[PDB]
Amino acid sequence: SLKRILIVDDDTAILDSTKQILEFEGYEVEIAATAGEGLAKIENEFFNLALFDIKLPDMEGTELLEKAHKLRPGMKKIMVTGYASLENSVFSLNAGADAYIMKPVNPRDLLEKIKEKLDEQEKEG
Amino acid sequence: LKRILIVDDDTAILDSTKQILEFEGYEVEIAATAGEGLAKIENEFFNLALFDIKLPDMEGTELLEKAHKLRPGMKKIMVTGYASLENSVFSLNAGADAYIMKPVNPRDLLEKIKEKLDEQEKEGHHHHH
Ligand code: NA
Ligand code: NA
Ligand code: NA
Numbered sequence: 180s181l182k183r184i185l186i187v188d189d190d191t192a193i194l195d196s197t198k199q200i201l202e203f204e205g206y207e208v209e210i211a212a213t214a215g216e217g218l219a220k221i222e223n224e225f226f227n228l229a230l231f232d233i234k235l236p237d238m239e240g241t242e243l244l245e246k247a248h249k250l251r252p253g254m255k256k257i258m259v260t261g262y263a264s265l266e267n268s269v270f271s272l273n274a275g276a277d278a279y280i281m282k283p284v285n286p287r288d289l290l291e292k293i294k295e296k297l298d299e300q301e302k303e304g
Numbered sequence: 305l306k307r308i309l310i311v312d313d314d315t316a317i318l319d320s321t322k323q324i325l326e327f328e329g330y331e332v333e334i335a336a337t338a339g340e341g342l343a344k345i346e347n348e349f350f351n352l353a354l355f356d357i358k359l360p361d362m363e364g365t366e367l368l369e370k371a372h373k374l375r376p377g378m379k380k381i382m383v384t385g386y387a388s389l390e391n392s393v394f395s396l397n398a399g400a401d402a403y404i405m406k407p408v409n410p411r412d413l414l415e416k417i418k419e420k421l422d423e424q425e426k427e428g429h430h431h432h433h
């Protein structure tokens with residue numbers, strides 16, 4: 180029933196605030212503070228959509244994306260980063276990201292982008 | 305056969321890339337401006353299009369947006385010598401399927417095209433069943 184979203188960011192403050200916003204909107208949410216943790220969850224649990232930070236402690240969020248997209252091509256993936264670059268944006272595009280947002284992002288904009296991608300997912304089947 | 309449109313005002317790039325793609329068995333059409341590109345997209349079927357960004361009549365990112373409205377199912381790969389954070393982020397958000405910085409390695413281009421066309425086939429299967 181409920182749409183399920185994974186948030187991956189080593190900033191636990193961002194995890195907390197983002198989870199609260201998403202849960203209040205009515206989503207079921209899981210959080211992860213490292214790329215390895217995110218990947219383990221993606222392997223074992225279903226998600227409609229994931230939000231990925233890029234500058235993660237244990238590996239670049241772009242590597243996380245690449246693996247996640249191989250595992251779950253149908254899942255939507257939005258990069259959300261305060262470390263945007265030409266290199267990591269081009270990589271994110273090639274690796275399967277569906278959207279790319281630069282921090283700080285406000286709650287309304289984040290929810291609107293998520294809804295848009297979840298709608299597109301439904302129309303795709 | 306799979307059909308590809310190449311849009312770039314650099315006619316030497318058009319010609320060389322057409323040659324390479326035809327050798328691989330693709331049917332290819334070419335366009336030297338965004339307008340010509342959009343006119344062809346409106347009037348004939350393509351599986352996939354390659355878009356330059358610095359075109360003379362409009363930016364390749366605008367072309368991408370318009371092309372996506374005309375043919376959302378068509379795959380789109382940006383191929384540019386003028387990559388920037390701004391236009392790569394825009395292309396990602398606007399629905400581009402891949403993005404290649406010149407100078408282009410044909411093996412890389414051919415691999416990305418094949419990957420995107422395989423994905424298109426899987427997508428079509430899903431839409432259908
Ligand atoms: Na980080
Ligand atoms: Na997808
Ligand atoms: Na994409």
Ligand code: NA
Binds near residue numbers: 357
């Ligand atoms: Na050009």
